[PDB]
Structures are given as C-alpha cells and as structure tokens.
Amino acid sequence: MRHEKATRLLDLARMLAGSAEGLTLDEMAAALGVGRRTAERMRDAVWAAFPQMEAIDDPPTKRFRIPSGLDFQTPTAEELAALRVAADSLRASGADARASSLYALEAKLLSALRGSARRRVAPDVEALVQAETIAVHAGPRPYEDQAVLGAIRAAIKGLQALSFRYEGGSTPGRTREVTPLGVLFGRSNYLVALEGKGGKPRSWRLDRMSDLKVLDKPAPPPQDFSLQAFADESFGIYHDEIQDVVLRIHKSRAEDALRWRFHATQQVTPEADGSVLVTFRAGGMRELSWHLFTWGDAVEIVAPQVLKDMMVQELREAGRAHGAW
Amino acid sequence: EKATRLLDLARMLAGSAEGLTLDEMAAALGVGRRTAERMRDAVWAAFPQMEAIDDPPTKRFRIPSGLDGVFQTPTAEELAALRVAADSLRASGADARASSLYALEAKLLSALRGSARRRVAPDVEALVQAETIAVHAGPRPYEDQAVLGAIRAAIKGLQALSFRYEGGSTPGRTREVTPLGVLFGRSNYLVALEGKGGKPRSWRLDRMSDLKVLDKPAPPPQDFSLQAFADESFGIYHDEIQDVVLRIHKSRAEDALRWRFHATQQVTPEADGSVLVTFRAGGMRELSWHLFTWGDAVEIVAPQVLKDMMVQELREAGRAHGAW
DNA sequence: ATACGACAGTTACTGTCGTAT
DNA sequence: ATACGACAGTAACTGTCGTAT
Known part of the structure; x- marks a missing residue:
C-alpha cells in the first residue's frame, strides 16, 4: 500500500x-x-x-x-462577516498567526454547512464584508512567527521552561531561560516571562527571539500571576513605576473625555465648571505623554510631576527638531 | 506549515x-x-x-460535499482565537462586533459532541488567559445596534438612508444619503454619498438619530471600494491627499524598517544610515500625532502643510504644558 | 512495548520548459 | 487556456540504528 x-x-x-x-x-x-x-x-x-x-x-x-469531536446550525451572514472582517483586519495588521487561525476557523466552519447554506449566504457575507472596514493604526508591525509563537504556547501548556536567544536588553546575543507567563499582542508582540531567581515579569519582544527550545524542566508560573493585571500595570506597553495620573480635560472637549478610554482603571468625574477630571494609575508615562499630545490644549497634567516633566521634555524635543521655537 | x-x-x-x-x-x-x-x-x-x-x-x-468530519472539527487554538478576538472588541468598547463572534463561538461549541466539547473547553480557557491584546487608549466606539442595524439594512436593500445628523455645518438637518459602508475606528463612521454626484464623506454614528431606511433605490458606484476610501487618509480625516516623505534618522532606523505608516508605503535605507519613508495619504493632524511618537528621530521633508500642521499642534501643546 | 533521535542513502518536491487535445 | 511530463538541481523523506522510558 x-x-x-x-x-x-x-x-x-x-x-x-x-x-x-x-x-x-x-x-x-x-x-x-x-x-x-x-x-x-x-x-x-x-x-x-x-x-x-x-x-x-x-x-x-x-x-x-481521533474521537468524533463534532455534531451544524448555519450561522448568520453578519456572524460570518464578523469572522471574516476580523481575520481580514488581523492580516492587514501583520498578525499573520492570529489571522491564520481565524481563516482556518472560517474554512472548516464553512465546509460544515450544507450544499444549500453555503452558496446561499455566500453573496450575503461578501456584501457585508465589503461594507465594513477596520481602520489600521500606524505603528510597529507585530512579529508573528508561528514557530516562536507555537513554542511559547507549547511551553505554557506544558508547565515548562522556554529557552531562546534574545538580541536586546543590556546584553544581546545570548541564550536565556525563562518561565513563560503569556503572550501580550500589542504594538509588537511580547513574551511575558520570568527570568532567573525571584524575578518579576519582564517583556521580551518576539521580534528579537531566535532559537526557541521548550526545555524539559517544570516552570510553573506564580499562582498569583494574571496576564491581564500585568498588562494593566502600564498605560501602553512599558512598565515604569506605577503613577497616579490626574488629568483635567477642558470643557471644550468634555463630551469626548466622558466617552473615552484612558486606562482600564479610569475614574472620570464631571466638574461643575464643565471640565472633566480623569484619574487612573498606570506606568508608561512616555506612551501616555504621546496620547495626551493628541488632546492638544484641552488637557492639564495635574499629576504626577514626572508626567508633567516628560510631557514638556518631549514637547521641546520635537519642537526644536521641527522648529517650533 | x-x-x-x-x-x-x-x-x-x-x-x-x-x-x-x-x-x-x-x-x-x-x-x-x-x-x-x-x-x-x-x-x-x-x-x-x-x-x-x-x-x-x-x-x-x-469540494461541494464538505470534508470528513475530522478535517472540520476546530481546534482549541482556533476557538481561543475567536475569543481573544471577541474579548478584544468587548474591551475596546465595540460591543456589537464582539457579540457576533461570541454568537459564533457559542454555535461552534454547541455543534461539538458533548464529550468533545467538555474536553476542549478547558484547553481554550487556558489558552485565552495566556494571551491578551493591548487596548489602545482612545474614543469608546459608538455601536448602537439600532443605528448599525439601520445602516446595514439600507446597504443590503441598496436603499437610501435618512438620519438627523447633529454635527457638521447645519446641525439638526435630517440628511438623505446613499450608504456605502462603515469605517470602524477611532469612533465609528458611516461613509456615504449625499445626493447628485457627491463625493464620499464620513458621518459619526453617535451624531445620528431618527434613522429611516427609505424605499428609494440608492445604488452606489461599483468602482468604489470602501477600502480604497479608508486608505485615502492616514487615519480617519480626509483632507487633500499629500505625497508624504520623511527620513527616519539612523538612530531609530531598525524600527522604521518593521513599521507600518500607511498601506501605500515605501521605506528604503538611505546611504548615510537614514531611512526614507514615503506614502500617499491625507489626514495631517493624525499623521503629526504619530510623528510625535518619534520625537527628534524624524524629519519632515514634504509637504510643508504637514510641517505647518506639526508646528501648529507642537506649539499648541507646548504653551499648554509650559514647554517654552 | 513506545518515544525518538542520528544519520547514510534513496526520492520527492520545486520550479522551469515545452509539447499537448 | 489548462492538463501534464520532463528534467536538472534542492530538500527533504526513509529506514537502520542506536539509546531512553
């Protein structure tokens, strides 16, 4: 045979x-x-x-x-359209891994309908999928090398240490042993992982990880570690010292302020004078200084001082580099 | 692979x-x-x-039949991908897009056999807690199911939509347009033509009310792809389209290489180590916000309208924060 | 028993180029 | 336009053979 x-x-x-x-x-x-x-x-x-x-x-x-593992009930166009434009948005960003998985979910999911259902909702979904587009942010393109990603998920699923050469961070070129904690899909993508004794989680750019190996040692994560919480410690990606941020949005932009996302932990409070007060704690002042720049003159940095400082040092740096003086 | x-x-x-x-x-x-x-x-x-x-x-x-049922079963990886993509929208503010994927997830699990569903259920749950997507700060999208419902319906019927638009130059006027699609983004927008040979302009969904789907044929152009229109801007705003050209100083050059400025992109390493970035798009404010991110490491060589836009907004905030 | 590599030695995939019905 | 060999040159597959559970 x-x-x-x-x-x-x-x-x-x-x-x-x-x-x-x-x-x-x-x-x-x-x-x-x-x-x-x-x-x-x-x-x-x-x-x-x-x-x-x-x-x-x-x-x-x-x-x-391979046990049976399947028994279908013909979902709607907009459900399907949701799935496709979802995957479309991802490959448009460069997140080929997350996109691939979703395209595979679509193919198997379509195939599982009947002769009727498939060709009948087909023009329906592409009508919708053409009448929807997700705007793509400018920024870094994420490294999604399902080899390295598959290795991370492998180690995480196994409770096993991951090993890789990393070209970054104060001593490039060399092999690092970590306890992998999770994957943080962001600007680029990041490994969240503990290195060495009594470490606390650090971010490892997937861009910079070669030569992954899923070692045969147990590397359980702290029982108290929450990938979300770790992500929510910063305003964007960078994990600075966690500041108490206090902002005052001018009334001219209050409507916006009251329907806006600054942080996972935000409390917005309207003020009698029509201005809006925004408080949250987070690291990542520089990344925050940038976003505040898009508020123009409608935001006052009440606190912290270090924010005030970095906002202005950033301002004057571009200001001469483009001639604002 | x-x-x-x-x-x-x-x-x-x-x-x-x-x-x-x-x-x-x-x-x-x-x-x-x-x-x-x-x-x-x-x-x-x-x-x-x-x-x-x-x-x-x-x-x-x-293949008209469908595969064998063993090539059809979705993996915990794909299931988890749906969820991470659902929970990503839920977190964003985008609760209407998100609940169609959760609806899809639901109908996927229900189609598994009992004993299979219970065996993959934890593998995905573990998968979804080892992965999360950074939520960028910004406007919480407006997704009123009844406002979106109205727009899609009109697009499916190739019908005119009329709404009251509290914005623009005469706020309160109820307007009748040809709906072309929806641009999900900072806030969400209806892209639509208004009347005789109009050019496509954007409408905030949160500035809409009194949405009627009229029974007047509203055929769009079929040269028009919503994607082309979206990419006319650097972000959301559609002013005059500029041939933008920048040099990233060789300090921040490796980032410039693996960076997305626009879909109409071209980045090439210059000789002195700089990187030349060229793309074609309107939307100079949003663009200048993004160039702020680079700080000193980017110089604007064209157009001057982007320089004046940068210095305007650079000077607007410098006064607001005490920089000079 | 299976898990699984290291490693000669056959062959299969890749692509370019024609010749077909 | 395909449906298809053919054919060098590239790349893996294969099976034998270790050693570990």
Missing part, C-alpha cells in the same frame, strides 16, 4: 477517525504501507494537526484514535 | 462555495502555480468529489 507524503496525512487521520478502539503504530504502518519509523513520524504529524487525537494504553501497547 | 498545506488546501476548497482559480490557490498558500497543480491533483485523490467548474477562460475547483 501507499500514497505520497502529502496525502498520507489525510489518509492516516481518516484512519484514526474511523477507528473505535484505535490503531497501533504497526497497524498504521501496515495500513500506510510505509513501515514502523515513518508511521511514527506520520502519527506525530496528525497529532500536531488534530489535537483531538488521544492515545489509550492497553499495556504493553498503545493505540491512537 | 508544510505537511498540512495539502489539508489546508482541501479545507479551502470545501468552504469556498464556488472554487478558486488555480492561481489564487497559489496565492493563499504562497506556492507558485505549478506546485498548486500537483496539490490540486492530490486533493482530488483525497477528495474525489471535488468538482471542476468552467468559468471562462479559467477553471474553478470546489
């Missing part, structure tokens, strides 16, 4: 899918006409592609099977 | 509903046309029910 490397994967997945009790490596090798070792490699491959694949030990041996 | 591209192709042809050209299979897998032929010849062996449909003067190929 046989058929070429590319199609043997479907052929083996189909086999483990239609087996009740599972097949052993020597059963696969005989059904694939390939022989023990590369059937192992093929079993490898389809487990990668079908994480639903389970193995059952009836010792001494071991049998592998 | 490359062991599953045959299977990635077979999924694409089972969902395409009318097929791909032999050459757009090559573009959605980055393969080169000849390679794709062999992929097609091998998908056909795995999926003999694949139809070949003439669409002159090329062919389409589609």
